[PDB]
């Protein structure tokens, strides 16, 4: 008998990525971009988008020839074969989801409390543990149910943020928008663009779902490209409104719910509540997509060296212990570091993943096509942004610097241990057609 997976259309895939991207940038890390970038935030989103499109150049070329739910791990194995590098990168991919869950946990709390509450290390942890555990339990009753609502939640929050843009363009303060020129603000804008690389993390949910996407050779590259452009214009369109309606120092003060307060001067409490409600569900749908679509896929891949040919995406479909591990280390990253920390580690983990993808594109450039000049250029740009991020933490928050360095080593060390015990190998079964199908 023939089994077949439920396949996603182009726009369902686009919506999925747009959802996680908006939930991670607009409603989560916006406060960290207020402090570091200031009035130069619209430029930060443009600059981060440029980095993303250079990475997209590699992803779209590779994703048009190499189809796999393994995502970037297929590209890497097609390039440098099976080894501890490839294996550590697959665990790193799983980690990218783990740390993102922490990022969403903090963002949720940042809009939950100022809606219903004090703000402290204990109250934050309570709101964080409570929302993660709810999604951990959602596997057993309603992860599929929320997953069916994801497409609607995205359309609504786009209308919510869509009114936020055009209604804000009547009450703008053009004097607060005009870009800063001072060196410390310019370098601050550049430093923020490094932490805001994660703002375009749609690469993960699309490629890890590529075999569950209709006409994947066509619709995966398209989804990645369309999805970046939508959020880039949304980011900028929102960033201008927020800064040109509230003093930036008040936004740094009210960091955790930056957009909630920024609506009050021009929409009232009807707008405040709308942005607060719109934020919670935005993050909710982003978490559901990250855990049930991303983390579950990346975990089984790192654990087994391959993925099942047939599985339900919107539940933890295999190795349930991984669900709790993903949820646990998701809290362990939200407990230690603050929003700046989590965001900094997230971008660092993503960049190393992207660096090896651009390298894979270069190794396989004869097979997949593209210009060598652009690939080499993309590699250097991403490498520089990565170093800038590491240099920033080295001097600003050295605890986060060691938090980043330990992760890459810890992931590398665990891979050595895992490959010794289990002997797990990665095979081309990730991307080679199953013969029966």
């Amino acid at each position, epitope marked *: *008998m023939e089994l077949k997976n439920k396949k996603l259309s182009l726009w369902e895939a686009v919506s999925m990525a747009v959802g996680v991207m908006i939930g991670a940038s607009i409603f989560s890390i916006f406060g960290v971009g207020a402090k570091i970038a200031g009035r130069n935030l619209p430029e930060t989103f443009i600059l981060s988008g440029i980095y993303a499109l250079l990475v997209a150049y590699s992803y779209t070329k590779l994703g048009a020839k190499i189809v796999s739910n393994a995502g970037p791990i297929a590209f890497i194995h097609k390039a440098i074969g099976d080894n501890i590098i490839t294996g550590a990168l697959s665990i790193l991919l799983w980690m990218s989801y783990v740390i993102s869950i922490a990022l969403f946990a903090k963002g949720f709390a940042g809009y939950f409390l100022p809606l219903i509450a004090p703000i402290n290390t204990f109250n934050i942890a309570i709101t964080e543990i409570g929302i993660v555990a709810f999604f951990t339990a959602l596997n057993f009753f309603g992860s599929k149910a929320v997953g069916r609502a994801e497409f609607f939640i995205v359309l609504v929050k786009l209308l919510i943020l869509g009114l936020f843009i055009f209604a804000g363009l009547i009450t703008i303060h053009p004097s607060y928008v005009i870009p800063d020129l001072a060196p410390s603000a310019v370098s601050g804008m550049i430093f923020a663009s490094a932490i805001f690389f994660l703002s375009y993390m749609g690469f993960g949910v699309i490629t890890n779902a590529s075999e569950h996407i209709e006409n994947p050779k066509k619709n995966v590259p398209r989804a990645i490209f369309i999805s970046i452009l939508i959020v880039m214009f949304v980011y900028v369109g929102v960033a201008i409104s927020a800064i040109g309606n509230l003093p930036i120092d008040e936004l740094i003060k009210a960091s955790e719910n930056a957009l909630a307060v920024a609506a009050k001067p021009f929409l009232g409490n009807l707008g405040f509540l709308l942005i607060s409600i719109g934020a919670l569900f935005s993050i909710s749908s982003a978490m559901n997509a990250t855990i049930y679509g991303g983390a579950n896929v990346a975990y089984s891949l790192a654990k087994d060296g*391959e993925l*099942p*040919e047939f599985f339900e995406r919107k539940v*933890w479909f295999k190795s349930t212990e991984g669900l709790y591990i993903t949820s646990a280390l998701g809290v362990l990253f939200a407990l230690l570091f603050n929003m700046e920390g989590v965001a900094s580690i997230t971008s660092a983990v993503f960049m190393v993943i992207y660096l090896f993808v651009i390298l894979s594109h270069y190794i396989l450039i004869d097979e997949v096509g593209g210009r060598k000049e652009i690939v080499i250029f993309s590699f250097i740009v991403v490498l520089g942004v990565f170093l800038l991020l590491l240099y920033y933490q080295w001097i600003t928050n050295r605890f986060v610097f060691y938090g980043i360095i330990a992760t890459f080593i810890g992931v590398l060390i665990f891979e050595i241990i895992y490959r010794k015990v289990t002997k797990r190998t990665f095979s081309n*079964n990730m991307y080679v057609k199953s013969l*029966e199908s």
Partner: antibody
Amino acid sequence: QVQLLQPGAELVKPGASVKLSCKASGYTFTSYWMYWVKQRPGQGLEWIGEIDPSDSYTNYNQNFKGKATLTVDKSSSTAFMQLSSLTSQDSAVYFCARSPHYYGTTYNYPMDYWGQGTSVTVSS
Amino acid sequence: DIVMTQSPSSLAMSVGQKVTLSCKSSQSLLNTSNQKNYLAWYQQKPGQSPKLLVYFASTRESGVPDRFIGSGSGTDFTLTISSVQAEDLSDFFCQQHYSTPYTFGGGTKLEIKR
């Protein structure tokens, strides 16, 4: 195209053991269950147990707990069934059979592709 | 364990004739959320492996003649052979694919009259 290779016959002495082999081809071995089925002459079919070839998870029919042990080898796409301390009762035809998995769902599936079965004969 | 019961024991039919084989289970094979019945039908020709005919109560396996029709739900199931052919001579086994341990019925033998 999809097939499971089983040796035709095995002769074994009472008290000894056999490792019956089931070689898969035409499909991704670790994406489907492997079931095993016992048929004695003039009798119906009895499901011995199951193995997930990806992580070696097993589940046995209570009647064969301690009698049969299921293992796989992933590289060779081969499923094995070991039968312990063989008696006259164990002489029969043993089938391996594929079964669709579909992870994270409530669907269980019957057996779509079967081996030709190994007729095991327990004799001195 | 789920007990599977088949009826009748054996039947002798000439070519073109219609027969209805029945299969009964001690427990419902209907998944309340799925709305699917986890019952399969097989054909075993003498000296051969069982061949899957029907699964989920009513879906014919690829390549199986239209003459075989499965129906029923809950505990009572049917395999209709609308026009038995010379080749159909065999044992027909039902199997619940609902719950482990998976269990088969004892079978119905079909022999051909001529």
